[PDB]
RNA sequence: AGUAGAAACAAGGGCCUUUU
């Protein structure tokens, strides 16, 4: 973990682990389930 | 979750939607205009007469239903209690415009055009400044011969003008173009003839009695009859000046395509034709003299500088030439504000006797003799006024070339397209344009010679522009459209032409151009009545 | 360095104050923008006069002292007041002789747009000026050839991530996706002495296709529209060949072909056509010049008003223009309203087939190849049509497709004998309405088209109206002509509206737009064709 | 971008937009909240992470 | 001979020469005017019904639904029948479609909410309710926000709605403070001062800053409505309305039957503003806002009442003088009543009837409109009339359409006989009279097809571009050397594309602009002989400058630009030739002096209490830009305050430069200690 | 004196506010 200034007037915290799952796929699946 | 939330907050902060409004909590879920006691107290007082509270008006409007029977009945009842007149012009013709009555309109342009007599001297590139030219002209000694007589031919305040002329000559002799503040300069420049403000807190009925006090009795302008001398100026301005290249110009650029060659050939022809006239001499005289006066009022305000009335030209095919039409001076031009006011004074030469009706403004002084043989002289001493805006526009009077070229190429391209061939030289040389009447007949001359008339028209629009000419040229369009309708047998009509003519005749006062153009418009409708309708004699 | 210490001392001095401290402490940083307006607010009515006024002044110019001292340029080389201790003349001295920058070849990259303009203009072979009354149509177009056209948000991120990285915002999706463009821009403008704001503004102009509503004649290509002023006016035409400059039509054409291919693939799945289409779109890309771009972003950026793109934009959820379609034809509703109303049509003897027809007055602009129209319908009848095209065949085809659009004519009441129930519907288990059947009928053979035109009443060309009349072969004038078919000269000006409508699509690829209207369908595309796509990636089994 | 739904589709997936829209219509509340509810719904679906 | 220039109209088309009439080649060119306007407004309202308000205790004439004195109706009447107006609104709604207005108010509400309150700064001059003077929008906004801050507490709001709710609260407040060389004012004086609308003599109104946001909201609704309508042309300009007219005329010539024959009428409404009432606008906005959120209902309802209660300031008063005019007294409007005897009979007759309405240096006006305020809402109200259609017209086979913009319209009537044409026109006049909209009988005219006029654009088979209107544009703005010539060329290009300017006219204007450019900056060609210090230095050093062609126009250059190269600045065409040393010096990035333009050396930069605040904001912004180099292009956003951002960024920069760059641990510690001290001082101070 | 319009200027503050 590490804190870091980002852009302007934003201090955030970043962790060096790639976590970008598909958002579209999961949302679509849940929406299809909602129709049963 | 945290990456999604970060992106979302960035995309909200970007749009100014990161507030409670769009992102409220559970409780703060009721956003509403903060209705105040006074705002309601007023809104409940603006509701129309039938209603007495905004609630009734809203309840009546939200449920409003259409009843076309009542609406149509009311429309017909309003259509009957009106009786809108409709007047086809063919039956109800346009009576001739009535022009005001009184003495002839007098000359008003700053610098004499027709009368003005000029002195030439070979150009010196090194000495190109205004003062440098004036000094060089003074040194030959022809200028120093002038010695006006005490008695003027006409006009008023002679002594002041004579004293100022002597003072100017002394200034130039000293090579310092600064005039001192004396009684004559003070009176002509009105240095102290500005009414002094009186406070109201220091006022009393006794003070009112001691000196009369009443609301200013606004002295509206007075009416002046048609000028009989304008035609002479036009005809003179449509003649060559024995010199060419009076107005400066840029250098034509290269060319790559046929279109550019055509544009450059037409522009060359028009510029060559238009550079030899006299109107263009006045364009040059205005551009240079006002440029100098602009660059003096900017630098030396509070000092009554001396500026010449001059121009630069070129002998026909050769050397160049500096001309000196006259001399000007400018009283204090302390232009603290836009659209200011600063009196100037203009001396100008002539070889002609002054008309009483025309040259009412001027105060001439016969001044010895001049060679060409010997001829008498006449020193025309005016006292006019100018502003910033008039200065800038006169200094940008070169605009007229654009308009004239646009009209000429709007006629030539249209005539060429109907035949699908380059018909410009033929149109220019041959196409006949009526330019007046002589001996009861309609004179006509090719376009190449009516460019001069068009240019003079645009120049005079620049010179005599005022509210009157604006209103006139805005209200005459209806008549021209009616004329076109008559030409094509389109049964035009109107509701109240008499009011239109009244509006027009209201804006005809003491401005030669308006009056002259109106008389010409009447002569036009008359000549067309022979081949058309909708106009009375 | 020491400058840093000066900045810190300045900050300390400001914070020592009370008011500045308050305004800095309170609120967020956005307040800066606001404050940026409360200061330095002053304009002038006539700037030209003011400039002439000021230039005359003894010392009009303003110059920093440290720059002049560093330059070590004479104070007055020849008794000229360059500065007290500045005149305009000073600049001349600098230009003619003075400190020289190491190289000025970077300017060609900063203003790549204008150098591109000059480079394109140098390759135009001018043919011949002619004179004639040119027919000009007022339509929206684009006047700047641009590669990889983007939106303002992407452009803003591109500037920040190419100039100010230390103050870059959190990494966006676009920046990750399009890293070759960011790298290319970064390399040229990194570690360079430059006015950063100027470069940013020029990159903004670089990526913005200037769209304008102008009169136009001839082909429509940005390469011409940028200099249309020097090609022709209302009365003249300067012929010139501009075909081979900044080809932008081949990539648009390829994009439309790809959308057609994917839309035709994804019609097989009756149950899951939509999902298959989206998956097919996402798992595909294509190369543009040097970079490789994802098809979805290209579709979002594009402005091709075509059923393929319209459908894809709907599927992804992109909003699109208020533009209808009917086959290879274009439409635009100027006015009117209506509501669906079913009516039967007997195909052969007695075979009822239902078809829906609107019921209200409705004006419609139309546009087929080299032809245009402004027709109107009313309660299942073509009220009138005014054409301003220039080709006989395009005129006839436009009129026929318009008649079909409004389901006018007897054939809709009593179908032609030729058409059969096999072709009426269910080519692949999906019903095909009557109108598209008639469209296929007319395309199939010219004779059917002639029969359809005959269906509309024919009258005798009255006197005077001879010029405003159209025969069966699209004649300008004849002795007998189609009923209520006005004709004029000059293309009908295309309307305009800056509106954005959300529209969904059905399981059968029927794009609804918040009302019954069918904006587009898969049954208004070329049947099929084989193509070899270059520099494309169909990463799907 | 003249209506809220377009602004939500800028970052939110259009499906969640349609969902929150239907939800607002059923409740009858202002549509200005199409964004907030959409965000919440997305968080849950993404939260699940299959 | 007697030369006459009009004779060219005898045998040549009138449009192809109408430009010659416009005197646009020359320079163009209180209380009496305002009093006459007030009187005409109170007269047009034909009724005499007067209520009495309690807040102001001023008789309030009601200009709606009280029509009387139906004499000489031809003249302008300012009474409105809300029933008729609502019926016309229903007709327009029906034609457009179901729920036509809800989508519009939705598209407006989508913006009114997220709008930043700094947008108000971009507007014409607005009256200031503190100094009682006209002032640019930004200064007035800053002044009133400082008054708010001094009164109760800093305005934390950042959006339009918060600002409006704070104005509504400010109306209630008994006292309001505001800075001055710091007077305080009671509720009633600020209540009057908020509504007060000044005037500028360019005439045109100047409403207070309290009313500006509500006006923006109403205008935004009117705009989103008008843009949809195809029978209006106010938002659009140039080509768009011409294309509209062409489509309209085609539709007309197609619809009309053979028996039917069309007519046109160029109309120019009169007293547009004087006869429009904001109460009809109030009712109309209520009808439009019948289904949408109550929020838009109130927000829209606000501006009409404010305008229906708007005071109007009398400016500069009368001037007194003696016979010789030596002396001269000045008197303001407030004291006019005292010296009522000392005025001309006409001025007294005009003033005396309004004394009851008159309040100190103001005259309460319960209605009327002023120039520029509600252009698009009146345009909508007037387009409503064209839609009208009734049984009688269809029975007689008559129908009228048209195209109206603000106070200027075009009408297209159709019928089968002139006896019916006249009746149709009278019907139109009546329906327009029912809602105040009048028509001038003198300036308005008609004719058979294909001869009309609309906003100074004359129409026939063709449409002659006026060109006169665009002549003033052919001037050098006067910003700098690089910008001026390119801007002029771009103006010429636009005029060529739209106003169908000819090529030779373009070349002449280009040469004229180049010569005025050479004259203003006191520059002249190298080969010319306009001696000057600049010119002499140029000439000697031009021997050193090897390439004559590449020389810049400002540096004794020559014109290398034409019709086919107007879309390319000179700096670009001459780049190749430009001498290497000359090019390097000309475009050296760092120099003392150093928007489709190139940035070169030629670019040069050439009531105090307020200056103090301006310098404070200037310093803050200046040093925030000093730290952050991307402050202007991309508006900052975050949760940190300015101080916190500066603190952290400065510390990070110091650490980066101590790590590698030329800084010593001593220097880094000194700077960091300074920063800590500054932070402590800032927080502790206030 | 003069300008122009439907009112304003005819300097204002305490000594200051040359190249078409």
Q: What is the DSSP string of E351-386?
A: HGGGTTTEETTEEE-SS---TTTSHHHHHHHHHHHH
The Cα C8–Cα E651 span in angstroms is: 10
CA distance E193 to E362: 10
Helix axes E375-387, E212-228, angle to 10 degrees: 30
Name every chain E residue with its beta carbon within 8 A of the beta carbon of C9.
674
Residues of chain C (242-261) having a beta carbon less than 7 angstroms from strand F = none
Q: Could you give the CA distance from residue C417 to residue C347 in angstroms, rounded to a whole number?
A: 7
Nearest nt (C1') from E325 Cα? F10
Q: How far is CA C340 from the centre of its chain?
A: 32
Q: Which two tokens stand for residue E290?
A: 């019948």
Which residues does chain E have within 8 Å of residue C68's beta carbon, measured at their own beta carbons? 592
Kindly determine whether residue D4 and residue E113, on different chains, have CB atoms separated by under 8 Å: no
* Cβ(C356)–Cβ(C341) below 8 Å: yes
Distance in Å from F12's C1' to B334's CA comes to 9
Q: How far is the CA of A7 from the C1' of F1 (A)?
A: 71
The Cα-based distances of B341 to B233, B291, B345, B463, E456 in angstroms read 29, 17, 13, 17, 33
Our measurement of CA E169 to C1' F10, in angstroms, reads: 50
Q: How many angstroms separate the CA atoms of B240 and C424, rounded? A: 85
Q: DSSP letters along C19-82, please?
A: HHHHHHHSS-TTHHHHHHHHSS----S-HHHHHHHHHHSSS-----HHHHHHHT--S-TTS--S
Alpha-carbon distance values, C34 to C31, E125, E217 (Å): 5, 18, 21
Q: How far apart are CA B443 and CA E678, in angstroms?
A: 89
Rg (CA), chain E: 32
Burial readout C35-49 (b: 16 or more C-beta within 10 A, e: otherwise)? bbbbbeeeeeebebb
DSSP state of B326: E
Q: For E457, how many CA atoms within 13 A lie in the half-sphere containing its CB? A: 19
Q: Give the nearest nucleotide to E536, CA to C1'.
A: F19
Rounded Cα gap, residues B517 and B464, in angstroms: 12
CB B388 within 8 A of CB B339: yes
Q: Give the number of other CB atoms < 10 A from CB of residue E59.
A: 13
> From CA B2, how far away is CA B4, in angstroms rounded?
5
The distance of Cα C201 from the centroid of its chain, to the nearest Å, equals 22
Residue located via tokens 């205790």:
E57
Alpha helix positions (H), B244-325: 258-274, 279-299
φ/ψ of E342, rounded to 5, equals -85, 65
Q: Choose the closest CB to C49 out of B14, B388, B416.
A: B388
Pull the structure tokens for residue C180: 């070759």
Instruction: Tell me the nt nearest to B177, Cα to C1'.
Output: F18
Q: Gap from C339 CA to F20 C1', in Å?
A: 71
C45 contacts B413? CB cut-off 8 A: no
Cα–Cα nearest to B123, from B310, B378, B351, B353: B310
Question: Exposed/middle/buried for E499, CB within 10 Å: 0-12, 13-18, 19+?
Answer: middle
- Name the nearest CA neighbour of E329 among B195, C513, B40, C203: B195
Contact A8/C at CB under 8 A: yes
Tally of CB atoms within 10 A around C78: 10
For chain D, the first-to-last Cα distance in angstroms comes to 32
Q: Does D24 touch chain B (CB under 8 A)?
A: no
Residues 423-442 of B with CB under 7 A from strand F: none
Closest CA to E368 of E306, E269, E277: E277
Measured CA to CA in angstroms, residue E255 lies from B324, C376, E392 at distances of 69, 10, 19
Q: Which two tokens stand for residue C515?
A: 């009302």
Chain-chain contact of D14 with C500 (C-beta, under 8 angstroms): no
Of E426, E458, E502, the CB nearest to B409: E502
Phi, psi of E303, deg, nearest 5:
-60, -40
**Cβ contact C236–B295 (<8 Å):** no
Tell me if D19 and A31 make a contact (CB, 8 A cut-off). Answer: yes
CA distance C288 to C147: 8
**C365 DSSP 8-state letter:** E
Min Cα distance D42 → chain B (Å) is: 9
Neighbour count for residue C210 (Cβ, 10 Å):
13
| A22–D contact, CB cutoff 8 A | no
Q: Which residues of B touch D6 (CB under 8 A)?
A: none
Provide DSSP, E116-127: BTTGGGSSS-EE
Beta bridge partners of E159: E116
**CA E143 – CA E165 distance, rounded (Å):** 18
CB E130 within 8 A of CB E150: no
Binding-site residue ranges of D: 40
Structural determination approach: cryo-EM
Interface of C with E in 246-265 (CB under 8 A): none
* B window 116-145: Cβ near strand F (< 7 A): 128-132
How many contacts (CB atoms, under 8 Å) link A and D?
A: 28
CA distances from B315 to B124, B125, B129, B134, B230 (A): 15, 16, 21, 20, 29
Q: Is E444 exposed, middle or buried (0-12, 13-18, 19+ CB in 10 A)?
A: buried
Closest CA to E64 of E254, E294, E308, E296: E308
CA–CA gap between residue C113 and residue C107 (Å, rounded)? 11
Whether the Cβ atoms of residue C63 and residue E593 lie closer than 8 Å to each other: yes
Query: C34 and chain B: CB distance < 8 Å anywhere?
Result: no
- Rounded to 10 degrees, the C-alpha dihedral B477/B479/B481/B486 comes to -170
Q: Is E430 helix (H, G, I), strand (E, B) or coil?
A: helix
Distance C490 CA to F7 C1' (A): 53
- Strand locations in E25-75, DSSP E? 50-52, 59-61
Q: DSSP readout, B26-62?
A: SS---------HHHHHHHTTSS-SS-SSHHHHHHHHH
Q: Cite the DSSP H helix spans in B140-278.
A: 142-145, 158-174, 183-189, 205-210, 230-237, 258-274
Partners of C354 in the beta sheet?
C344
Nearest-angstrom CA–CA distance, C201 and C196: 9
B320: helix, strand or coil: strand
Residues 22-41 of D with CB under 8 A from A: none
Q: In this complex, is the C-beta atom of B536 within 8 Å of any C-beta atom belonging to chain D?
A: no
Measured between alpha carbons, how far is B51 from E255 in angstroms, rounded to an integer? 44
């Amino acid at each position: 973990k590490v804190r870091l200034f980002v852009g302007q007037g934003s201090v955030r915290t970043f962790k060096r682990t790639a976590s970008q799952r598909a958002a579209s796929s999961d949302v679509n699946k849940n929406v299809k389930k909602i129709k049963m | 979750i945290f990456s999604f939330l970060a992106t979302a907050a960035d995309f909200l902060r970007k749009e100014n939607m990161f507030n409670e409004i769009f992102l409220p909590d559970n409780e703060e879920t009721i956003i509403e205009m903060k209705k105040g006691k006074t705002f309601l107290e007023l809104r409940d007082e603006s509701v129309p007469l039938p209603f007495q509270t905004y609630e009734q008006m809203k309840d009546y409007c939200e449920k409003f239903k259409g009843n076309p029977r009542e609406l149509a009945s009311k429309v017909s009842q309003m259509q009957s209690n009106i009786k809108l007149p409709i007047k086809h012009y063919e039956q109800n013709k346009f009576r001739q415009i009535r022009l005001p009555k009184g003495p002839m309109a007098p000359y008003t342009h700053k610098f004499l055009m027709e009368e003005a007599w000029m002195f030439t001297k070979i150009s010196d590139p090194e000495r190109s400044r205004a003062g440098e030219i004036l000094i060089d002209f003074f040194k030959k000694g022809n200028l120093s011969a002038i010695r006006p007589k005490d008695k003027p031919l006409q006009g008023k305040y002679p002594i002041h003008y004579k004293n100022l002329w002597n003072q100017i000559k002394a200034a130039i002799a000293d090579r310092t173009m600064v005039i001192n503040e004396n009684d004559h300069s003070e009176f002509l420049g009105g240095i102290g003839r500005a009414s002094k403000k009186i406070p109201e807190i220091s006022l009393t009925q006794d003070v009112i009695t001691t000196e009369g006090l009443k609301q200013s009795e606004n002295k509206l302008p007075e009416p002046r009859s048609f000028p009989r001398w304008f035609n002479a100026e036009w005809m003179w301005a449509i003649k060559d000046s024995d010199l060419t290249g009076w107005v400066p110009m840029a250098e034509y650029p290269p060319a790559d395509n046929e279109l550019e060659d055509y544009a450059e050939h037409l522009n060359k022809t028009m510029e060559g034709v238009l550079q030899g006239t006299n109107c263009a001499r006045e364009m040059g005289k205005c551009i240079l003299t006002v440029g100098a006066l602009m660059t003096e009022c900017r630098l030396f305000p509070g000092k009554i500088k001396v500026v010449p009335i001059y121009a630069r030209s070129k002998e026909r095919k050769p050397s160049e030439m500096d001309c000196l039409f006259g001399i000007c001076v400018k009283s204090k031009s302390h232009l603290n504000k836009d659209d200011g006011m600063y009196t100037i004074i203009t001396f100008e030469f002539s070889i002609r006797e002054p008309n009483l009706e025309k040259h009412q403004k001027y105060t001439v002084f016969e001044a010895g003799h001049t060679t060409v043989r010997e001829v008498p002289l006449y020193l025309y001493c005016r006292t006019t006024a100018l502003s910033k805006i008039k200065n800038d526009w006169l200094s940008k009077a070169r605009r007229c070339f654009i308009t004239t070229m646009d009209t000429v190429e709007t006629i030539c391209l249209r005539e060429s397209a109907k035949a699908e061939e380059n018909l410009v030289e033929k149109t220019l040389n041959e196409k006949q344009m009526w330019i007046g009447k002589k001996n009861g007949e309609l004179i006509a001359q090719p376009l190449r010679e009516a460019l001069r008339v068009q240019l003079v028209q645009q120049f005079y629009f620049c010179i005599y522009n005022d509210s009157q000419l604006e209103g006139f040229c805005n209200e005459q369009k209806k008549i021209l459209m009616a004329l076109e309708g008559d030409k094509k047998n389109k049964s035009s009509f109107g509701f109240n032409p008499e009011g239109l003519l009244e509006k027009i005749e209201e804006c005809l006062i003491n401005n030669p151009m308006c009056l002259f153009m109106a008389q010409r418009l009447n002569e036009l409708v008359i000549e067309a009545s022979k081949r058309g309708a909708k106009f009375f004699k | 360095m020491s400058l840093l210490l000066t900045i810190a001392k300045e900050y300390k001095r400001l914070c020592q104050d009370a008011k500045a401290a308050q305004m800095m402490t309170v609120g967020t940083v956005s307040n800066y923008t606001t404050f940026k307006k409360w200061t330095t607010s002053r304009k002038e009515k006539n700037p030209s006069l003011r400039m002439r006024w000021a230039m005359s002044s003894k010392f009009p110019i303003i110059a920093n002292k440290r720059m002049l001292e560093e330059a070590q340029i004479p104070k007055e080389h020849n008794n000229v007041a360059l500065w007290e201790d500045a005149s305009a003349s000073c600049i001349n001295y600098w230009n003619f002789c003075g400190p020289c920058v190491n190289n000025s070849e970077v300017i060609k990259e900063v203003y790549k747009s204008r150098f591109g303009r000059l480079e394109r203009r140098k390759e135009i072979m001018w043919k011949e000026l002619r004179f004639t009354l040119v027919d000009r149509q007022r339509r929206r177009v684009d006047t700047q050839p641009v590669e990889q056209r983007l939106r303002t948000g992407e452009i803003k991120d591109l500037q920040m991530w190419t100039l100010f990285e230390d103050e870059a915002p959190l990494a966006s999706k676009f920046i990750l996706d399009n890293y070759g463009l960011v790298k290319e821009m970064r390399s040229k403008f990194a570690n360079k002495p430059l006015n950063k704001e100027v470069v940013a503004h020029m990159l903004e102009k670089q990526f913005n296709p200037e769209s304008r509503f102008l009169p136009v004649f001839g082909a429509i290509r940005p390469e011409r529209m940028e200099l249309i002023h020097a090609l022709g006016g209302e009365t003249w035409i300067q012929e010139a060949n501009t075909a081979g400059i900044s080809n932008v039509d081949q990539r648009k054409n390829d994009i439309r072909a790809v959308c057609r291919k994917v839309c035709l693939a994804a019609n097989a799945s009756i149950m899951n056509a939509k999902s298959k289409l989206v998956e097919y779109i996402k798992s595909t890309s294509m190369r543009i010049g040097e970079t490789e771009r994802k098809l979805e972003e290209l579709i979002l950026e594009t402005d091709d008003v075509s059923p393929e793109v319209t459908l894809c934009k709907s599927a992804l959820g992109g909003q699109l223009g208020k533009t209808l379609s009917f086959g290879p034809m274009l439409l635009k509703k100027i006015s009117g309203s209506g509501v669906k109303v079913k009516d039967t049509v007997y195909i052969q003897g007695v075979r009822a087939v239902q078809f829906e027809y609107w019921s209200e007055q409705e004006e419609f602009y139309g546009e087929y190849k080299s032809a245009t129209a402004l027709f109107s319908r009313k309660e299942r009848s073509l009220e009138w049509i005014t054409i301003g095209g220039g080709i006989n065949e395009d005129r006839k085809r436009l009129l026929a497709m318009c008649m079909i659009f409004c389901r006018d004519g007897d054939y809709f009441k009593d179908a032609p004998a030729t058409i059969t129930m096999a072709d009426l519907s269910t080519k692949l288990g999906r019903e095909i309405p009557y109108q598209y059947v008639m469209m296929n009928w007319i395309q199939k053979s010219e004779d059917n088209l002639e029969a359809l035109l005959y269906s509309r009443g024919i009258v005798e060309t009255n006197p005077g109206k001879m010029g405003s009349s159209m025969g069966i072969d699209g004649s300008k004038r004849a002795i007998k002509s189609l009923r209520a078919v006005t004709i004029q000269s000059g293309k009908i000006d295309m309307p305009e509206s800056k509106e954005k409508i959300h529209l969904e699509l059905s399981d059968n690829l029927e794009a609804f737009d918040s009302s019954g209207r069918i904006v587009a369908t898969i049954l208004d595309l070329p049947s099929d064709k084989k193509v070899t796509f270059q520099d494309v990636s169909f990463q799907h089994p | 971008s003249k209506t809220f739904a377009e602004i939500a589709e800028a970052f939110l997936e259009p499906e969640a937009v349609r969902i929150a829209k239907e939800a607002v219509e059923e409740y009858g509340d202002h549509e200005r909240k199409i964004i907030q509810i959409g965000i919440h719904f997305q968080v849950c679906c993404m939260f699940c992470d299959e | 001979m007697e030369i006459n220039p009009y004779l060219m109209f005898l045998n040549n088309d009138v449009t192809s020469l109408i430009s010659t009439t416009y005197p646009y080649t020359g320079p163009p060119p209180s209380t009496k005017y305002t009093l006459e306007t007030i009187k005409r407004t109170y007269d047009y309202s034909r009724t005499s019904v007067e209520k009495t308000s309690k807040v102001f205790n001023i008789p309030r004439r009601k200009f709606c639904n009280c029509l009387e004195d139906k004499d000489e109706l031809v003249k302008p009447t300012g009474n409105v029948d809300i029933s008729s107006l609502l019926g016309l609104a229903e007709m327009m709604e029906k034609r457009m479609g179901e729920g036509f207005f809800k989508h519009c108010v939705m598209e407006a509400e989508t913006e009114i909410l997220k709008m930043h309150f700094s947008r108000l700064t971009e507007g014409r001059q607005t009256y200031d309710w503190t100094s009682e003077r006209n002032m640019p929008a930004a200064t007035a906004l800053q002044l009133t926000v400082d008054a708010i801050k001094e009164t109760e507490g800093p305005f934390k709001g950042t959006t339009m709605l918060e600002y409006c709710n704070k104005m509504i609260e400010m109306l209630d407040w008994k006292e309001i403070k505001f800075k001055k060389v710091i007077d305080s004012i009671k509720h009633d004086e600020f209540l009057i001062r908020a509504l007060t609308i000044n005037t500028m003599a360019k005439a045109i109104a100047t409403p207070g800053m309290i009313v500006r946001p509500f006006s923006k909201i109403v205008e935004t609704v009117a705009q989103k409505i008008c843009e949809k309508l195809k029978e209006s042309g106010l938002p659009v300009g140039g080509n768009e309305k011409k294309a509209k007219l062409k489509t309209t005329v085609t539709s007309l010539n197609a619809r009309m039957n053979s028996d039917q024959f069309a007519v046109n009428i160029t109309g120019d409404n009169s007293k547009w503003n004087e006869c429009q009432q904001p109460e009809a606008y109030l009712a109309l906005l209520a009808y439009i806002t019948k289904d949408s959120s109550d929020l838009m209902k109130d927000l829209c309802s606000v501006a009409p009442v404010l305008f229906c209660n708007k005071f109007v300031k009398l400016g500069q008063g009368i001037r007194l003088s003696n016979k010789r005019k030596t002396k001269e007294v000045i008197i303001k409007a407030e004291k006019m009543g005292k010296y009522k005897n000392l005025m001309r009979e006409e001025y007294k007759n005009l003033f005396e009837p309004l004394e009851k309405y008159i309040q100190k240096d103001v005259c309460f006006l319960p209605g009327g409109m002023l120039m520029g305020m509600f252009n698009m809402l009146s345009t909508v109200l007037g387009v409503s009339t064209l839609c009208y259609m009734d049984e009688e017209l269809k029975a007689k086979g008559c129908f009228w359409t048209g195209l109206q913009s603000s106070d200027d319209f075009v009408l297209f009537a159709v019928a089968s006989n002139w006896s019916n044409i006249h009746w149709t026109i009278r019907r139109f006049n009546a329906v327009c009279k029912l809602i105040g909209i009048n028509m001038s009988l003198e300036k308005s005219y008609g004719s058979l097809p294909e001869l009309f006029e609309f906003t100074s654009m004359f129409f026939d088979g063709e449409f002659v571009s006026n060109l006169a209107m665009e002549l003033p544009a052919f001037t050098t703005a006067g910003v700098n050397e690089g910008v001026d010539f390119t801007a002029a060329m771009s103006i010429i290009k636009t005029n060529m594309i739209n106003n169908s300017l000819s090529p030779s006219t373009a070349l002449m204007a280009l040469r004229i602009c180049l010569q005025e450019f050479r004259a203003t900056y006191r520059v002249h060609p190298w080969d010319s002989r306009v001696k000057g210090g600049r010119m002499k230095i140029i000439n000697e050093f031009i021997k050193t400058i090897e390439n004559k062609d590449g020389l810049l126009i400002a540096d004794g250059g020559k014109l290398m630009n034409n019709i086919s190269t107007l879309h390319i600045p000179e700096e670009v065409l001459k780049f190749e030739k430009m001498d290497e040393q000359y090019r390097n010096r000309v475009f050296n990035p760092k120099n003392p002096f150093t928007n489709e333009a190139v940035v070169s050396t030629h670019s040069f930069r050439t009531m105090r209490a307020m200056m103090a605040e301006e310098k404070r904001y200037q310093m803050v912004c200046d040093m925030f830009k000093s730290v952050f180099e991307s402050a202007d292009i991309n508006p900052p956003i975050g949760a940190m305050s300015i101080g916190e951002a500066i603190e952290e960024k400065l510390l990070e920069r110091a650490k980066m430069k101590r790590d590698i760059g030329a800084i010593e641990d001593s220097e880094y510690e000194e700077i960091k200690d300074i920063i800590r001290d500054a932070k402590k001082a800032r927080l502790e101070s206030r």
